[PDB]
Amino acid sequence: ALGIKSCDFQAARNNEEHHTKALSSRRLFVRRGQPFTIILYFRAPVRAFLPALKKVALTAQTGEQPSKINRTQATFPISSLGDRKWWSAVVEERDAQSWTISVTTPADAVIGHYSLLLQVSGRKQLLLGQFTLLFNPWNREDAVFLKNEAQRMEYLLNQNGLIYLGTADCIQAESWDFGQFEGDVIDLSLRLLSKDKQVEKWSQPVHVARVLGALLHFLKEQRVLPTLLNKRRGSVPILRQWLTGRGRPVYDGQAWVLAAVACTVLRCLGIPARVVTTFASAQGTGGRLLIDEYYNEEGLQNGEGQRGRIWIFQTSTECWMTRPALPQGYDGW
Amino acid sequence: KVYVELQELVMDEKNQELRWMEAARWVQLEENLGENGAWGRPHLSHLTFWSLLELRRVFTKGTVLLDLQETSLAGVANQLLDRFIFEDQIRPQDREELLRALLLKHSHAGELEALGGVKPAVLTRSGDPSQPLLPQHSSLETQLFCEQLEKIPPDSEATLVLVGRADFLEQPVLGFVRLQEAAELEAVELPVPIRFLFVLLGPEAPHIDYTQLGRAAATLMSERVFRIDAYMAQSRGELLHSLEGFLDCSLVLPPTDAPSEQALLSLVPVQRELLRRRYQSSPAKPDPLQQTGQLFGGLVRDIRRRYPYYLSDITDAFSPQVLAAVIFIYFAALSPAITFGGLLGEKTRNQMGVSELLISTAVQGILFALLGAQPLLVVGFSGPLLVFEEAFFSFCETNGLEYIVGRVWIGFWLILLVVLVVAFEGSFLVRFISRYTQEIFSFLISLIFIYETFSKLIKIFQDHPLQKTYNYNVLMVPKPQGPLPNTALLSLVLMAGTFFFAMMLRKFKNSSYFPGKLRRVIGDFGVPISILIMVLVDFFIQDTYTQKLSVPDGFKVSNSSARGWVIHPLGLRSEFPIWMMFASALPALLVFILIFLESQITTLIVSKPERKMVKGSGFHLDLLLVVGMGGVAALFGMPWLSATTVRSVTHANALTVMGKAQIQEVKEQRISGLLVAVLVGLSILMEPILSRIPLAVLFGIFLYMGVTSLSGIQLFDRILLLFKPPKYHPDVPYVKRVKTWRMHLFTGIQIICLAVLWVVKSTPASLALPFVLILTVPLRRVLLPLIFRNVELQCLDADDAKAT
Amino acid sequence: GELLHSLEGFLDCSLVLPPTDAPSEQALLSLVPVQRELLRRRYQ
Amino acid sequence: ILEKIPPDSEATLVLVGRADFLEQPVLGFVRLQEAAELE
Amino acid sequence: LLFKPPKYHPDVPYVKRVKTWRMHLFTGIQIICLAVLWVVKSTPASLALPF
Ligand SMILES: CCCCCCCC(=O)OC[C@H](COP(=O)(O)O[C@@H]1[C@H](O)[C@H](O)[C@@H](OP(=O)(O)O)[C@H](OP(=O)(O)O)[C@H]1O)OC(=O)CCCCCCC
Ligand SMILES: CCCCCCCC(=O)OC[C@H](COP(=O)(O)O[C@@H]1[C@H](O)[C@H](O)[C@@H](OP(=O)(O)O)[C@H](OP(=O)(O)O)[C@H]1O)OC(=O)CCCCCCC
Ligand SMILES: *[C@@H]1O[C@H](CO)[C@@H](O[C@@H]2O[C@H](CO)[C@@H](O)[C@H](O)[C@H]2NC(C)=O)[C@H](O)[C@H]1NC(C)=O
Ligand SMILES: CC(C)CCC[C@@H](C)[C@H]1CC[C@H]2[C@@H]3CC=C4C[C@@H](O)CC[C@]4(C)[C@H]3CC[C@]12C
């Protein structure tokens, strides 16, 4: 006598509360460590609430082989005794035919695509719906927590960025569309992350950032071609071309866009990030603090260049998290 | 009417010479020409959207030659190309190529087989037909109607449509020519004058099929309103107006992924209104349990329902599945005939024994298979029939009245009763026997069958108990007088082996192994293979005694001193009472009630809509035939027979083929039952074959039949769903819309009914079983609604397993 | 352009019934055999 | 109406109107990035 | 799988990546080894089986 009719994931309001409104108003995008609310609809009225509450449990799984040892599978009941710092669920409001359930996730949960499943004593598992879990710069216990709301807006919610190019004495700001909240960027980023088989480590922003940076550098080396060809429309078309091979490729005179693409992926996954330009960057030294420049008697350079050169500028991705595996005092950028 | 011809510019295959070959002809209905050289079937013309677009565009800027003073194809081509060049439709350098094209040999269907077929082509500048460059599309009409002339009125004037392709063209061109006087042309072999000429030429383009363009032009010319307007047209504008009104009243049918006859039939008012609007501006005008209140109406309707299907009733039996079913049902009807036979024989002074029951089971089965409306029923003797007969022999022996003669009078009253009920359509009340009563009766009868099958093994274990010591010289004639070693154990082994082999071959029928052909063949022959295997198993053990089948010596009476093959209605030894000549009504009423209930419920169970029976069942005809042959056989001291449930259900199952779990169809034919009855009659002749078949093998077969008869029983499923946690319950209407405890209470009420019926059976008042069964019809309708809701009863008690 | 290509494919599988003096039931039911084949490959 | 609609269904709104101040008929086809419940 | 029509063979790596006749030939060579070992067992030199 506890048959489920439908489950309203309330994507619009939860997405507004979780700062994922720009992603969708129909798909549930939630940031870990923050409660979100779903509505459970029953086919028939629930006569006795307490025995019905004893008979129901919720299950959240991520990945293709969820397990309790990987923290990719979690089973929690619906009660006021649930651990609000862990996976939990509690009925905030109810009538005869519906339950308003507030579901929480741990601040160190594995990110990615999730399935919410209902288990009603003496019945089979029922799929309630799908939601995507992200990092939470708004949660104090998260590793990517940001103190300032203005910094949170700037480094996670703003899709209109500026990549600084030019020389040190003549800095030209180029408007850039990071587009991290485009409809496919989250799916593409999670698909790229799926090439890493340590899904248990996806709760760690350091591991996720390292994996995605390595993979995006590999894609940049694979897809960027030697020398309109310089017309750019932000990070999202570049990411689409790198991951799928379709679209306008990027040529080697604009190889600095890797920083912006990495910033877009990190921002879409919930890791605060910014693009940083260093003018007069000595690249290719291997740690050596010397640069050799060779000029002929006319004051000009003959060949194509040395391995260690002073670049006019170099872009780089900065990202914000704590460093638990590092000694004290290295949290931040 | 009118005759229209369509010719395509094509190349032959032998000499590679381009020419004109006719492609289709219209006399209102369109006929198409296949590649073989014969004419396809006559059909209403359907046009494509692009063809009508092409025709409208080329007709808007067309070339009309109205009231043209000529009577020759060559000169008409000359004048048409002259007006083409004058209207700048073609360049003047193209006149030589098009006149060469328009005046080739116009070949017809009579010379297609003489040549090597026809292939599409394009006239090129050099006059050479090259191969078209655009992708080819084989004709839709040559794939739907052409794959397998007297209607022309004498005064009608023909129309010739010429379509051809010529790369030397900027755009497709249309020239419409009406002659002032109808003339015969060398292009048309039929002796009808030609009045209108359609010429459609041009270059391969996107969306221009010139065969479809010519089809559209010919269909437009075959339309009465356009033809009448064209006979009186004095300008191209009037023809364009007629074509505009033709397109205004056209029905375009868009593609859909759900093609249905009812959805298309919903467009009838649209079609009628479009026809009305097209002819509004024209001067012309457009050219089974029903109570029929009729006496014997149900019988006649059953006759008209089943007898039209008589030809399929013989042809559909030509499959090895039918032969395997015959082998199955032969034993399934022979062994109960023998068993019950000697019982009545041992309990009725051999007045009625195996001989009488073999002949009555044979004759009634033959005539019921040849005449009945549901041939899949098996006519045989039932337990209620053995008990009533013992009831009568007891009463007559008490009162001095004779047996055979009373039963002669019981049948005589039975015939009157059945004629009465068929006259007033009394077999209509079988519309109140819902699935409740049907399932209760079927499940109870299956349980009785299984119980008797196990009780026979218990009896043979009692006759030859397991002992330390035996007597090694025990008389065997007629049956062993004392216990024998290794008999009961071998019988149990044979019965278990037969059942196991039959079930394993049933599983192998639906299994995944061996070629799908051999597996199914082997699958339908599961029961015969099991019988053969166990018979050879017992035959190779010569020492151990096992009870075999026993058939009588010949086709004589079981007691030659008690009666003859016939019986005098007024007495055999003494004067029979005249009150018994009237008292025989009430026991005749009881026998009629028994046979009616058994046969009607058996027909209801077998002819369920979920079992894919599309040939119909005749309640009135089957009841009339069964009771009539019972009464007639009573005139010869022969037994009354009814459509028993287990044998008929087994016959239906053995003639049912399974799809890829799903019932596909049933081999509804008369050959199987006829052959079963013939073999039952001939069983006396083939005594050497039957004398080496043990009874234990047939006991295993009986257990198989009783177990497999519970397949479609929803009551059995709801029995099982009482021992399955309320989670594995399958998704069915009575599960998903009824609470689990409510369904269990409904099932328990049916269990109470089953227990009451089973207790009644094991009592001396076992003839009350039909009456107590018709106390479930009251409940299913009267009470039940008092404790249940409408949706609950709709889900639990459904006519065709529907969710209301 | 892709929408136009789909629309032309839709028109390629559209059947036109001209005004034909046959009774409406038979004239409409004659389209069943033809729509069937003209949609054999469209929904495959 | 609501019973016959499958649960994962999206709407198409076809707007038809006559405006005498337009030179030619115009067709506007819109696919939204995600389904929306327009107020 | 030597007695089952190929349309039913399970979606396993050794069926998908190997031709059906090749897999049956491999099963046949294993059956030949099995028959050789069975013959060895039923001989007075049955202690040569492990070799
Ligand atoms: C002799 C034994 C006792 C018989 C009388 C027993 C009388 C009695 O107690 O009935 C109520 C009780 C209710 O049990 P209920 O359905 O609530 O419990 C579910 C049941 O045990 C399933 O078998 C479990 O599946 P699985 O193991 O996880 O795969 C399921 O696991 P989960 O949902 O917790 O994960 C259980 O929740 O049992 C019945 O199911 C009724 C029909 C039972 C059969 C009736 C008798 C055959
Ligand atoms: C004894 C019979 C022949 C012996 C020699 C064996 C040689 C021999 O006869 O070929 C066997 C056959 C090969 O043919 P193949 O498998 O291609 O043929 C398929 C097979 O007949 C399936 O049974 C059919 O499906 P279904 O099941 O009807 O639904 C299927 O029909 P379709 O739906 O695809 O159109 C057929 O295409 O495959 C076996 O059965 C393997 C077991 C053979 C081992 C038997 C050795 C004892
Ligand atoms: C055939 O019927 C006759 C008479 O109906 C049977 O003869 C009777 O047998 C019983 C049993 O002992 C006794 O009443 C008499 O011995 C006989 N009565 C008369 C009037 O003759 C005979 O047994 C029957 N035969 C068979 C094989 O059943
Ligand atoms: C339904 C059918 C069987 C008819 C009902 C039976 C009654 C009405 C009829 C049928 C045959 C009739 C019998 C026919 C012949 C004779 C012989 C005569 O010397 C005395 C009357 C007597 C014995 C009749 C009595 C009444 C009778 C038994």
Residue from B396, B559, B563 to probe ligand 3 pocket by mutation (most atoms less than 8 Å from CB)? B559
Bridge-based pairing state of the strands A126-134 and A28-31: parallel
| H/E stretch holding B364 | helix B354-371
Residue B270 half-sphere exposure toward CB, CA atoms < 13 A: 14
Question: Which CATH number is B36's domain given?
Answer: 3.40.930.10
Whose CA is closest to B334, among B800, B690, B792, B751? B690
| H/E stretch holding B524 | helix B516-524
Asked if the C-beta of B518 comes within 8 angstroms of chain E's C-beta atoms, the answer is no
**Beta-carbon contacts of residue B686 (< 8 Å; ≥ 6 apart):** none
Cα separation, B627 vs B620, in Å, equals: 11
DSSP-based three-state secondary structure for B202: strand
Return the ∠ at Cα A214 (arms to A211 and A219), rounded to 5°. Answer: 120
Whose CA is closest to B777, among B601, B594, B589? B601
CB-based burial, B186-212: b 16+ in 10 Å, e otherwise: ebbeeebbbbbbbbbbbbbeeebbbbb
Contact criterion met (CB < 8 Å) for C17 and B253: yes
- What superfamily does domain A4-134 belong to in CATH? Immunoglobulins (2.60.40.10)
Contacts of A1 in chain B (CB under 8 A): 739
Q: What is the DSSP string of A10-30?
A: -HHHHHHHTT-TTT-SSSEEE
Contact criterion met (CB < 8 Å) for A25 and D33: no
**Beta-carbon contacts of residue B259 (< 8 Å; ≥ 6 apart):** C32, C35, C36, C39
Delimiting residues of CATH 2.60.40.10 domain(s) in chain A? 4-134
Cα separation, B697 vs B549, in Å, equals: 11
Atom of ligand 4 nearest to the CA of B416: 1
Contacts of A123 in chain B (CB under 8 A): 726-727
Chains that touch D (3 or more CB pairs under 8 A): A
Cα separation, A70 vs A58, in Å, equals: 18
Residue B617 half-sphere exposure toward CB, CA atoms < 13 A: 24
Asked if the C-beta of E4 comes within 8 angstroms of chain B's C-beta atoms, the answer is yes
Q: How far is the CA of B118 from the centre of ligand 4 (A)?
A: 85
Report helix, strand and coil shares of chain A as percent, to nearest 5: 25, 30, 45
Whose CA is closest to B500, among B537, B464, B463, B550? B537
Contacts of A183 in chain D (CB under 8 A): 33-34
Contacts of D36 in chain A (CB under 8 A): 25
B514: left (phi over 0), alpha (psi -120 to 50) or beta: left
Resolution for this experimental structure (Å): 2.7
Q: How far is CA B798 from the centre of its chain?
A: 23
Q: How far is the CA of A199 from the centre of ligand 3 (A)?
A: 94
| H/E stretch holding B5 | strand B4-12
Q: What is the DSSP string of A113-127?
A: EEEEEEEETTS--EE
Contact criterion met (CB < 8 Å) for E3 and B515: no
The answer, yes or no, to whether C and A have at least 3 beta-carbon pairs within 8 Å is no
Top CATH class of A149-333 equals alpha beta
| Method by which this entry was solved | cryo-EM
B501 and B530 Cβ atoms separated by less than 8 Å:
yes
Contacts of A23 in chain D (CB under 8 A): none
Residues shown for chain E: 51
B111 and B22 Cβ atoms separated by less than 8 Å:
no
Q: Decide whether any atom of ligand 2 lies within 6 Å of the B49 Cβ.
A: no
Strands (E), B297-403: 379-380
Sign of CA dihedral B680, B684, B690, B696: positive
Cα separation, B199 vs B194, in Å, equals: 14
Cα separation, B112 vs B322, in Å, equals: 47
Chains that touch B (3 or more CB pairs under 8 A): A, C, E
Asked if the C-beta of D23 comes within 8 angstroms of chain A's C-beta atoms, the answer is no
Contact criterion met (CB < 8 Å) for B253 and C31: yes
Q: How far is A59 from chain B (nearest CA, A)?
A: 18
Q: What is the DSSP string of E1-51?
A: --SS-TTTS-S-HHHHSS-HHHHHHHHHHHHHHHHHHHHHHTSTTGGGS--
Q: How far is the CA of B416 from the centre of ligand 4 (A)?
A: 14
Q: How far is CA B307 from the centre of its chain?
A: 14
Return the ligand number nearest the Cα of B574.
Answer: 3
Asked if the C-beta of B516 comes within 8 angstroms of chain E's C-beta atoms, the answer is yes
Question: Among all residues of chain B, which has the CA nearest to that of A126?
Answer: B727
Cα separation, B31 vs B22, in Å, equals: 11
DSSP H stretches of helix in B635-739: 645-654, 671-682, 687-690, 695-708, 714-720, 733-736
Asked if the C-beta of A47 comes within 8 angstroms of chain B's C-beta atoms, the answer is no
B23 and B35 Cβ atoms separated by less than 8 Å:
no
Q: Which DSSP letter does residue B711 get?
A: S
Query: Rounded to 5 degrees, what are φ and ψ at B64?
Result: -105, 130
Measured CA distances, B566 to A317, B558, B559, B677 (Å): 111, 13, 13, 22
Radius of gyration from C-alpha coordinates of chain A: 24
Q: How far is the CA of B350 from the centre of ligand 3 (A)?
A: 9
Contacts of B275 in chain C (CB under 8 A): 19-21, 24
Which residue in this structure is represented by tokens 């996720």? A208
A103 and A117 Cβ atoms separated by less than 8 Å:
no
Tokens of residue C35, six digits? 């729509």
Cα separation, B277 vs B110, in Å, equals: 41
Q: How far is the CA of B510 from the centre of ligand 2 (A)?
A: 14
B189 and B172 Cβ atoms separated by less than 8 Å:
no
Q: What is the DSSP string of B119-152?
A: EE-EE-TTS-EE---SPP---SSTTTTS---TTS
Cα separation, B393 vs B408, in Å, equals: 13
Residue nearest to atom 12 of ligand 3 (CA): B349
Q: Decide whether any atom of ligand 2 lies within 6 Å of the B516 Cβ.
A: yes
- Domain with B57, as residue range(s), is 1-275
Sign of CA dihedral B629, B633, B638, B640: positive
